[PDB]
């Protein structure tokens, strides 16, 4: 009953050679069986360095080269062999597309991932094909949301954006906006929800294919929802989430953020105790843990400790990024005890 999520890049499993490729598969397979939990949200882009850019994907489509057909496959295995639902993991924003799209601008007066512009409805189309060929070539369950759908305070300053904002009762200075905090305020607020609304617009085109049972979730960074006023430059809010998605993936990842070794427990309970004063929030909300040190591997001790401490503070629905599965990192034997949902009817 509690969700249980492994979150995986397909770049893990990835060979030229076909042959080891599949032999890599087949592991991963085992591996999420062997683990005993709900959910795993699977990466349908390409991005093995990291670079906040994707150019290729795992999946036919129109517009991007695949790197190899995997996607359909490692999720119908997952979801028929391993025992688990699968979300399709996507970028909303970070996409090589066209150059003639619009990217998302910074302030060219402001004090000083690869995005487009949401506000651009070229950009919204062409995304919105990407999703649509992801949809028409595999079976999925729900669709993941990547954390790149954000803004800062001193975005998105195009003139698409722009006009947005004026349509909206903004000033078209963005400047002035800033010099006001009312109106700061209400243009931050206003841009959370125009990032929200154009996910949502994802999903339904990806539901036209696969149809309404089709679950969403988003990943929101942990400075919303533990210093709200935060939202000012992320255009993520937490109760907008909850509101809008099924699952909210909160990314309860301290050492990315920079906290303190010895300090990680204590922000992570923090974390907690934010969500259970927003009632039922906990009920809609998966706490991702890190399993990597951004790189380095967080000890299975470790992660297994910080799951103790989650279910602890009444957290049930939790999980971790990424999962090393070729080299049994973190160590099943280790995480399973504190992860597995085998045990509940």
Known sequence: SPQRIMHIDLDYVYDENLQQMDRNIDVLIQRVKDMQISTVYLQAFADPDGDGLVKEVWFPNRLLPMKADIFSRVAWQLRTRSGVNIYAWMPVLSWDLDPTLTRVKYLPTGEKYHRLSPFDDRVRAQVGMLYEDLAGHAAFDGILFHDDALLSDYEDASAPAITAYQQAGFSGSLSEIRQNPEQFKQWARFKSRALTDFTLELSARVKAIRGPHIKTARNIFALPVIQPESEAW????????????????????????????????????????????????????????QAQNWHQAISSQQLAHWMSLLQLNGVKNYGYYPDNFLHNQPEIDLIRPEFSTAWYP
């Open 234 to 289: 992320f255009a993520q809010n937490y109760a907008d989430f909850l509101k809008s998605y099924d699952w909210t993936a909160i990314m309860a990842m301290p050492y990315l953020e920079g906290v303190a070794e010895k300090s990680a427990d204590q922000w992570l309970i923090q974390l907690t105790n934010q969500i259970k004063n927003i009632p039922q929030a906990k009920d809609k909300s998966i706490l991702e843990l």
